[PDB]
């Protein structure tokens, strides 16, 4: 029973993904530049205020 | 099994069964309703509820096909963001075994074929619908998947460094630096590139990596 | 053992007997072994008060008429091959003319033998396997091998005179087409669906006309071959197809006068001003030669695996794969008599050259029929 | 403690004397790539430099490395060539 | 109350046209000095005629084309010597159905020039007993008994129109089966031998045929091309009517 | 028109229905109008029996709707799957959820029959059943009756004077006659097999020096009964030609010598067809071994009829050397990347070796916990030199659970249990823990092994086992044997396929209250503690400080369920000074596999086991480390621990108290003389052998051919003692004769259940001797 009386409206129990080290760039030193990126694994900056974790509900609207 | 009833009461009792929490009865009723009247008003609702029932019941192989069919047949549905989020969530949940995590072993250097698909789907959702109610969770999962892929590549580079294949580790770390130049994995993997450049006596090239790690030592 | 792995098919039961007459067997003698479940044209022949017959193995019997007396018997098994005891696999129709008998086999070998002694007059290898009854005419023996290669053996000694390359489709029906000779020109239907007339004494095509139908419903199956023997009368050639166009056409390179949507693989006969035939699904029809207007259609028999109908005393005798013999009146299509002559089953055409009637069972013996 | 087995490790670009002698100063990227082949490694930090490593160690009997460094300009001209047959740092 | 009488393929035969045709044929017979048998038989014959008309109209209305109404008006004005729109409609239907039937029959017959074939009048009634494509179930049998009964009752002296409307299948059953003026060289080949022995005022017995057992009764005693084309057209049209009726779906509502 | 009343609108919207009629509300109506409206309702193809009714109050229409297809049933489809049938019905539009058309059903039926033309069924009959259901619905049944499949009557080959027809037919696949004794197929004709069979015929004539031979044409005739099929093939075998010389040329890339050696053929031997393609493939493999992965090799023969000779010209073109950019594995959801990548002979950033990648794939197969391992070399899109290597692997259920207790003939409970993994969460370790806790014994064995302690592959393993075989509840007379041992082994590979192992071990053993047995007293007198033969009160202690060695050769295609190769495993332990015992023991296991078909299905298995142990000097090998045979793993057909000698019971007062007519082994009031018993004491020499014929399963299709194995086995075994004395017994049997070769034969089935490999075996002994207990049915987990 996946519902289990409190698991009826949220994602699977594991939530290790909430705690992740924030991504920080590498400073370019003098006399050289870091290699140009590829633009295939990047995340844009977007407004927050969206419920995450078990707060967000997953059931058809 | 199921009776030959009009969609009203069968749909109502399927909803009641799902609200109770018994997934098997709900999935059987929804399958019967979809196979009975695959033209009626409830078809979209039937599919959107079948996806949820598949995901909760741990039937991801069928869920992926159902999501693909729904997104293909309705490329302009008002709630495509929900189905995209469900696809990106089931692809990521397929990457966990629920038994390895009991002992705490890191599921990072395993086969990253589902993590890449989940990252692609989450990126597609974020690009397509910036103003939805799933964007923050999608971005958090994107960051987690990026870190996981970086750690996998770092593990492969570490194995090549241990064996003594310096060209291979140089190429792997260069790929990490070109693709993932912000994750902690690259920051911890730069010394491997330093050592690999050191082994081939190419000190002139090694000084550049030394400067890279010195400028970011803080 | 595959009989237990196949579902039972539906076949129309035999009708009421109403035996007005009960023919009997004049002599129920036997010839060789049986050809078995091998579709071939190996009917016996009758001439000069004797009858010639052969089996699948290669044995040839000449038998006396008016009784079951066995005149002589020879063996045509290959005594000169790799094993020197191989079966010849005789399949060409046993034809007789003068003092000669012509037989064909599915080994590209056509044999001609002298009568009253059974000695091999000669043999000849032809292009492809012989599968049609040789036709003797104008000092030549026309054969229609199952490759589209119509051939003409020299009667005197046996040699290739010329060849004609008829078309051949990919999944053709059986090609047992016997050419017929009129006014020094041969007419023959290939497996493509085109009836062609060829100048015999020079080896040049005179004309070719397509007698077939459209692609129909499905391309798979739905064959369009013409393996029945064209019949020439009054300068008119009659031919039949598988899907069907009962075509009557002018002999002097003329076009067609009419056609019908009727398709047969067995032989059809022309008597007086009427055409009698049996087609696929085993229906016996009598039609008018003037415009192909159907006179009557007896169809109570259905999928009985009939044979070529024959004339006898003004009525139609029809064989059956169940060993029965059915008798049909010339008009009104009403049944007249039934005869359970044998249980082996019939597959070849009856012969009615004289007042006698002969039928050869596929797995058994020959049979003579009285009134 | 040196009796265990070890597969021979190949890491280089497999340079040969004829191929390196074929190259002369003043060529372009396309024809040098056609002559030698794509480099398996090149610096991603500062400029356009091509490294041709030939590293080969059989079992335990030493290590043999031949190094080639090609320095190019902005317009893809072979500005400088340098070769090193063995490990200078002995 | 236009309840659909029968269903054929897609279209249907209603009840309005049935009554209309009954009234038209009754009035025309009255002005042509004719009488009528039991009304149930007339109604059934009219219903069968409309079923045939609809099934032949389906193959030629969904395809082919229509007829220009100006030539239709000229033709009706010329042939002249109730509701105007209705009668115009039935005349248009008759013209289009005649055109499509003529086209379909002309497709099925080829005529070589009469030179290779080289080279009196009768007014007669044609009674036909319809037969199925495979009368294996002994249809021809009862059918034969009915044919002999019809011949007997014609000998007894009953009205020819009655026996014609009784169990005919030709399109002239509503007019006694008349075929107009026909020459001995303008008749089917199954009829020439009968005509040779035929005589005015007598009856010719049934002739076996694929279409059915024909009954021929004699009432009154570049040319070769049309002479042979007429008989070929008649025979092949009868056969094609039989084929089309056999190869269709018909549902009867009662 | 004031209103319109509808009687019979259930599945049709009233608005669209009203739109259907040309007339609507507030319109003048007459006969022509209503007639045209009825015709218009039937123009849309939605109704079946509509009719207007005489109603003074405005309009009244009764409408009958075409029923909706509720479900479709396909009863009778013996040889056709239902999903394809449903797709075919969809193709004509008869899918569930649409109105049923009575007009279309016949066509529907026809369509189904046409589909059967594909399979080979021609006289098929399909019947449509329309079962009414309330709410205006129908249930559709398609009753099938497939008549017969096409049957080949005879394949004929016309024109030849060198070979017979039967010889050529015997190598085809469309057998025209199946023997009445063997039935491994039917005479079913498929268009796809014709090309393959014709290619077989062409190769058969080509390889025997027929260069000018070609296929004229072929005909596939159908009899006019839609049941029989004839096949005719025309040929022109030509003449016998001989090969003369080879003139290979092209861009050899400096490899002319060994290539010429590869193509070197002596003149005078006839032309061949398989030789040319074998030589081309060998040249391609040799070129690929040095780096040239994508060459172009063409063979062209020039034939001269003056001497009927043929000269073969081979044009070879070696392309650019291919390097490897990255090798990545897919499908390893459990096993980590390091486990797969640590066994590879081709490495990133190196010139490609077509043999190194194959060695890597074979090593992955030999590892033992991968079901299928497929290699794939994909060209890099934007590069002409670089290539990628991908290993597609599918995981398998490694590990095993061993359970069961054993309560036969009211025996004591033994809750034994064991877990084997061979892979711990994919980490590559080998962890195994087993044993039982009991009121009369205790067993606990734990084994850990890391096979890659270093990079090269040294394996470090340890094993700790504590076993108290007490057999004791309350009485002291039981043979109490308490022993704890710890073993540590280190192994390393030398050359290839060969591993050596050396290790240390400590075993502390103690025996008390031992039953009188002659071998026991012989061992004790070898140590010469001089025990008495009239009392059961004995104490024995020993501390073995041993030294273990071993050698392993393993070259076989698959780690589990092998089909080719050989394995040899030698293990031997020797004592060193400082222990109470002095002995040496060696054991040797061998398993050889030989395939028969090129497809590797029928297998010949040859298994042997040998064992010899003897004291170093003065001392003799202890009885508690003896050898044993029989059981479900060594000689199938006998109970475990049965082969070999039998114990002799010294009778005396303290041997058995004889309480309540129990303990009747050698008690003084139940026996007086030395007796030969049925208890099996192990011998110090063992030799067993076994021959297995492994055949494909006759019960399961090919989708699970590598899940269960069936084998007919014949086993031989013997065990004997060396330090035996013959004349010391006047008439007791001599257990030192290595001649009583116990034999057995039977059948065996192996299946990997999700608890381990379960083995069933039925064996019937063919040779039996005194004291040899035989069991026919055996079952184990292993």
Residue numbers in the entry:
A (entry chain C): 25 to 85
B (entry chain D): 26 to 243
C (entry chain B): 22 to 392
D (entry chain E): 24 to 113
E (entry chain F): 25 to 105, 123 to 160, 172 to 273, 395 to 427
F (entry chain A): 26 to 807
What do the authors report?
The outer membrane is a formidable barrier that protects Gram-negative bacteria against environmental threats. Its integrity requires the correct folding and insertion of outer membrane proteins (OMPs) by the membrane-embedded β-barrel assembly machinery (BAM). BamA is composed of a 16-stranded β-barrel, which, in E. coli, is preceded N-terminally by five polypeptide transport associated (POTRA) domains that extend into the periplasm. Unfolded OMPs are delivered to BAM by the periplasmic chaperone SurA, but how SurA and BAM work together to ensure successful OMP delivery and folding remains unclear. The results suggest that SurA binds BAM at its soluble POTRA-1 domain, which may trigger conformational changes in both BAM and SurA that enable transfer of the unfolded OMP to the BAM lateral gate for insertion into the outer membrane.
Given the importance of the BAM-SurA interface for OM biogenesis and the fact that BAM and SurA do not form a sufficiently stable complex to allow its co-purification from cells, the BAM-SurA complex with an in vivo formed disulphide cross-linked at residues K27C (SurA) and R76C (BamA), was purified directly from the E. coli OM. Both conformations showed the expected BamA-SurA β-augmentation interface, but they differ in the conformation of the bound SurA molecule. One structure has SurA in a ‘Compact’ conformation (PPIase-1 bound to Core), while in the other SurA is in an ‘Extended’ (PPIase-1 released from Core) state. BAM is in a Lateral Open conformation in each structure, as judged by the position of POTRA-5 and the conformation at the lateral gate, and indeed in the Compact structure, a salt bridge appears to be formed between BamD and POTRA-2 (BamD-D28 and BamA-R162) which is observed in all BAM Lateral Open structures solved to date. This shifting around BamB results in an ~ 18 Å movement of POTRA-1 between the two structures.
